[PDB]
RNA sequence: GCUCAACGGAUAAAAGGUACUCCGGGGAUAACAGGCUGAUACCGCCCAAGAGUUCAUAUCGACGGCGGUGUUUGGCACCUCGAUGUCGGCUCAUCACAUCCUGGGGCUGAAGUAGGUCCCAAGGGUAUGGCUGUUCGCCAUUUAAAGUGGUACGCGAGCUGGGUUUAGAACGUCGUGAGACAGUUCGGUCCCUAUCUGCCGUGGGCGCUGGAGAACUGAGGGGGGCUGCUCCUAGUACGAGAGGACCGGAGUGGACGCAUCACUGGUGUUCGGGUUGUCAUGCCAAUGGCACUGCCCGGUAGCUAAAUGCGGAAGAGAUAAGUGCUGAAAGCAUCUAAGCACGAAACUUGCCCCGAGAUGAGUUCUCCCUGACCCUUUAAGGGUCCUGAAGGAACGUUGAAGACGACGACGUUGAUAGGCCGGGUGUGUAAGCGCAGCGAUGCGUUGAGCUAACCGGUACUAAUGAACCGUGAGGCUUAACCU
RNA sequence: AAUUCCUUGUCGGGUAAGUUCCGACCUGCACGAAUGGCGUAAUGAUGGCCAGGCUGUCUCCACCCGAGACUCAGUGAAAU
RNA sequence: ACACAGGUGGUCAGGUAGAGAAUACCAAGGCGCUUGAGAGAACUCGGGUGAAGGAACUAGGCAAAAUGGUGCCGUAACUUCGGGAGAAGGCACGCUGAUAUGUAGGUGAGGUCCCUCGCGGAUGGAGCUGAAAUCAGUCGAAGAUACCAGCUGGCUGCAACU
RNA sequence: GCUCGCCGGAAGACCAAGGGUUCCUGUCCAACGUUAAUCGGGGCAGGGUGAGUCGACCCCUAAGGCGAGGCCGAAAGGCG
RNA sequence: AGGACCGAACCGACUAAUGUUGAAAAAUUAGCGGAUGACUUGUGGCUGGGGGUGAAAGGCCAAUCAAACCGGGAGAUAGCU
């Protein structure tokens, strides 16, 4: 259940291709207040799709 | 396999389902606008919904059974005065689902679940 | 669906009333017999004075399940217990001469007419 | 002056036990398995004395001979003692053919039926129990048949731990004894989160020479291949009768496999009801919490088998053993040398599935892009500005798709999901009120009320205007056409 | 037989079928009288066997409820 | 060795049901166990239910399942006369009403009498408490309804037993 | 803060033994806490324990220890 | 009355499963035995290594027992790796 060989640290490489991190593609932008926030989410000020969805 | 079936288990047992849609059901009843994780806030709708169309015929056994869902008389006077009538027009869809990111402490995906007529 | 170690209800005269099912016949590795099925089968109760004896080995044929069966419309006929009748080695002509109980439209055939002449109902 | 005889004589002077054990070492040396070998074993063959009424060779085969296999019992001690876990069962298997069944034949001391024997054939199939730790074996009852072997006497980083083989105890037996016994008896810790190969699945990347969306061809690979019984032919052929067919046709099964949920059912802690104890909602009434879902009774959808559909083929090609036709060498004969025909569940096809990473990267159809310039090291070059298509991806609502990716549906021009409305289904006459009753309770209102995943509807809520990726006519060389 | 090698002795019972069990036989390989002999009610988390009830033990598994496994975020080992 | 499912002596002992310090639910009081969030595959873990069959499983009924309370009836071989024995087996069981607006029983006040006189002795029965049984009725599939709570019998080896 | 759930012959309360400031308050979040932490039994600073009757000490002895002299023993020492 | 019976505390450990780099250097879960006695428990004492102690398993004597632990002879010896 354990090695027999150390794995190379090019094998390690090879392992980890495929853990490398998806940038968020595009933010969207409020067409009210201007801001970006992630598609399909309320702004941080608490704006979406215009309207002001929750006070602060 | 989980073919054509429904409702979230929400690594909870059963019991503990039952009672905390009764407590969150009656916090969104209470103050019309919570902040919870997106799969509870989706499954609400199956719970605080029914309850407000149950609240549309003010009658007698009606809210023996609103407080036999609620289990609070606050929350059912709140839905048979005011929540009843102020949704006495609309076709269901009380309410609406606002995602608002992730937590800080976990990464869950939170949502703010609000009635419709609040603002 | 009867099969090994099965006990049986026994449906005639023949002087046994409590046999079991040792194999099912007709098929390498079958599992179960229905009704219209031969099984050979050993005696373990019987009355003082019978045809058979307790711990004869012969053949029955299975007249009622409790599993039941089914009709082409999709209907089932299912009984309260499990119920055969004796038969001969040789033969294969039933031992008892009168069968108790009701049997089934898929007993009758050329091998068992006797049978379903025999019994008060006919299902 | 030593049978110091273990005779180059360890001392004048010395036996045992250890399964309570321990250390140093050894694969220098045993038990397991491999290896080598093949006496033995098993399977063939040669000769033919005889048996077989006669008749060696239908079936047998004495005396003897020659081989094969690696398969038993062994031989050897080459690998491993700084560890290669072992009998049997279980669960997966896989191969061989010296074939148990089914298939094709030859001969028969083959009437038929049923056999004997040998040849071809490995496609598929190939019991359940009783006893015993058993493999084996005997027995019971099946079956078309219950094949023989290889696989570390396949398989313990898959399971078991009954046997063997630790420490306890006992019997018989042996020993003065400690103890010992392939003698028995009762009891007795089975670890490992998988790096690589392998395998089952499922993705990312890039390639396939402009890019994109589809539909394909099929190189190749896999799956599947079992069989009973009854009826007809026909009581015909055969036979003294008893009995009883080939060939051909039809039906119905067993086992196995695939699919499915219409039926019959199971489950259905998300639906309804009953009920016990207790606590709470001010109390009554009515509910809820907890007690395995408290304990039950039913049950929707889904998933399911025991439920019910379907499958194994037919056919074709080339064949094995075999059977021939014509026909010489060899005036004859002869299946073969030339030529031709037939011949099996094997082989290649036919059936099903995967499948162009088939780098030999294929084919078809459709769609999209028709800008300017700088550059020096001038080339399949580098850059700037303009441009951003077809499409994709991301995000969202999600799914009878799913570990995750993937795949499919949908995103307002919208039924994708939730809600809502209606229906269905399930449960079984809610609550409240009235009546009857001393009361428990009964009756009426009432097939009431509630009803999940279902069916048909419905924009009520959530599916955003965008942005992002992808570009800007696509090398060389010939060839054939076009002017 | 907690003792019996031959041995699965033979016979009987039980079972469709019983190397175990129970009852006999005696041919005690290799019982035997306080390293006690033979019985024995009661008792035993004791050994073997049989029957009734019971059942997913099994034919042959199906579904469901939860805890992991799986995905995300945080922390972050080990034998070799 | 750990903010470790372990171990650690004494004292306190509420309610309802119950024989009970069992057990269920609660009071006073104290907690939610120092990673969460999703998803709802295989497989593992701990459970639930199961058609038909019912030990065919297996070394072996291992494990599961089942039995389970109280009262009454009834109970074998054998025996050291104690046992065996809860042998086995069976019946009853809720609620309401009546007997009895709460009985039998318990408790025991005023009143009266007596007295060596007091924290006295009679008498007296108010009030409180309260089984159990019978009869009648009534509800459910099921009344020891949950938790809790013996599987039973036959043969035999060994050891008397705790 | 409001609900929900759990213990309740304990997962509540009081001690002994043992520990030794973990107590209370302010402040801090590096490390420690199997994550974050504003929180903490963590760091830092301050505060906190009041007895004629509680307990110890003390008076008394048990098992036992030590033991003037003594007896015994190469020495050490043993017993009393 | 009882080394009586059933059964919690308490004491024990028969069976199974889990666990086996565990929550745990022997435990948990569901069952199980004893439970007025040869019972169990607190505190304190005493017995010392060829010695103790042992309802006897070569059991136990500080996670160590066919002769404990620590220090010393001591760099024992090792024809062995
Ligand atoms: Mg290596
Ligand atoms: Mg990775
Ligand atoms: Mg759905
Ligand atoms: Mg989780
Ligand atoms: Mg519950
Ligand atoms: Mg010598
Ligand atoms: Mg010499
Ligand atoms: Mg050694
Ligand atoms: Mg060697
Ligand atoms: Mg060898
Ligand atoms: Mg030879
Ligand atoms: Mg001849
Ligand atoms: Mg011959
Ligand atoms: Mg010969
Ligand atoms: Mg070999
Ligand atoms: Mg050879
Ligand atoms: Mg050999
Ligand atoms: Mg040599
Ligand atoms: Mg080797
Ligand atoms: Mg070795
Ligand atoms: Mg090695
Ligand atoms: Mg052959
Ligand atoms: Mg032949
Ligand atoms: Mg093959
Ligand atoms: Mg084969
Ligand atoms: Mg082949
Ligand atoms: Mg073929
Ligand atoms: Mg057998
Ligand atoms: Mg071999
Ligand atoms: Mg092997
Ligand atoms: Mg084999
Ligand atoms: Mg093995
Ligand atoms: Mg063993
Ligand atoms: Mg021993
Ligand atoms: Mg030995
Ligand atoms: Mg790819
Ligand atoms: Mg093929
Ligand atoms: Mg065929
Ligand atoms: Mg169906
Ligand atoms: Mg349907
Ligand atoms: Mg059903
Ligand atoms: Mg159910
Ligand atoms: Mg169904
Ligand atoms: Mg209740
Ligand atoms: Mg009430
Ligand atoms: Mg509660
Ligand atoms: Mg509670
Ligand atoms: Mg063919
Ligand atoms: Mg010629
Ligand atoms: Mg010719
Ligand atoms: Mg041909
Ligand atoms: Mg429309
Ligand atoms: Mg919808
Ligand atoms: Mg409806
Ligand atoms: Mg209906
Ligand atoms: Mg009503
Ligand atoms: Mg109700
Ligand atoms: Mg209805
Ligand atoms: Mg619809
Ligand atoms: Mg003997
Ligand atoms: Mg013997
Ligand atoms: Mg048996
Ligand atoms: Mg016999
Ligand atoms: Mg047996
Ligand atoms: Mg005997
Ligand atoms: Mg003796
Ligand atoms: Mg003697
Ligand atoms: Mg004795
Ligand atoms: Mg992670
Ligand atoms: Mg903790
Ligand atoms: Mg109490
Ligand atoms: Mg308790
Ligand atoms: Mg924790
Ligand atoms: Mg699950
Ligand atoms: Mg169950
Ligand atoms: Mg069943
Ligand atoms: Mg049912
Ligand atoms: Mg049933
Ligand atoms: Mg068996
Ligand atoms: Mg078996
Ligand atoms: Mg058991
Ligand atoms: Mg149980
Ligand atoms: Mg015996
Ligand atoms: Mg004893
Ligand atoms: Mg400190
Ligand atoms: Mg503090
Ligand atoms: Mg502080
Ligand atoms: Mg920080
Ligand atoms: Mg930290
Ligand atoms: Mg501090
Ligand atoms: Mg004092
Ligand atoms: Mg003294
Ligand atoms: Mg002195
Ligand atoms: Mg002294
Ligand atoms: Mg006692
Ligand atoms: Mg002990
Ligand atoms: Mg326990
Ligand atoms: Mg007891
Ligand atoms: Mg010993
Ligand atoms: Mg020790
Ligand atoms: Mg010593
Ligand atoms: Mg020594
Ligand atoms: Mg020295
Ligand atoms: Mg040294």
């Known amino acids: 259940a354990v090695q027999q060989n150390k794995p190379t640290r090019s094998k390690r490489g090879m392992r980890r291709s495929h853990d490398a991190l998806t940038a968020v593609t595009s933010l969207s932008v409020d067409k009210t207040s201007g801001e970006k926030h992630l598609r399909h989410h309320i702004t941080a000020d608490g704006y979406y799709r215009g309207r002001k969805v929750i006070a602060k | ?119 | 669906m009867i099969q090994e170690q099965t006990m049986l209800n026994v449906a005639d005269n023949s002087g046994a009333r409590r046999v079991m099912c040792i194999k099912v016949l007709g098929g390498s590795h079958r599992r179960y017999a229905g009704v219209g099925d031969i099984i050979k089968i050993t005696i373990k109760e019987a009355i003082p004075r019978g045809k058979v004896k307790k711990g004869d080995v012969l053949k029955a044929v299975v007249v009622r399940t409790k599993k039941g069966v089914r009709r082409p419309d999709g209907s089932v006929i299912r009984f309260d217990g499990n119920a055969c009748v004796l038969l001969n080695n040789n033969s294969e002509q039933p031992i008892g001469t009168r069968i108790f109980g009701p049997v089934t439209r898929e007993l009758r055939s050329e091998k068992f007419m006797k049978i379903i002449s025999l019994a008060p109902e006919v299902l």
Do not use: W
């Open chain 2, 1 to 119: 396999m989980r073919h054509r079936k429904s409702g979230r288990q929400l690594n909870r047992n059963s019991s503990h389902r039952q009672a905390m849609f009764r407590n969150m059901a009656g916090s969104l009843v209470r103050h019309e606008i919570i902040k919870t994780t997106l799969p509870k806030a989706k499954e609400l709708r199956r719970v605080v919904e029914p309850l407000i169309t149950l609240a549309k015929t003010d009658s007698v056994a009606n809210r023996r059974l609103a407080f036999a869902r609620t289990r609070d008389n606050e929350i059912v006077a709140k839905l048979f005065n005011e929540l009843g009538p102020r949704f006495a027009s609309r076709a269901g869809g009380y309410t609406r689902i606002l995602k608002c990111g992730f937590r800080a402490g976990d990464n869950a995906p939170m949502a703010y679940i609000e009635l419709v007529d609040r603002s």
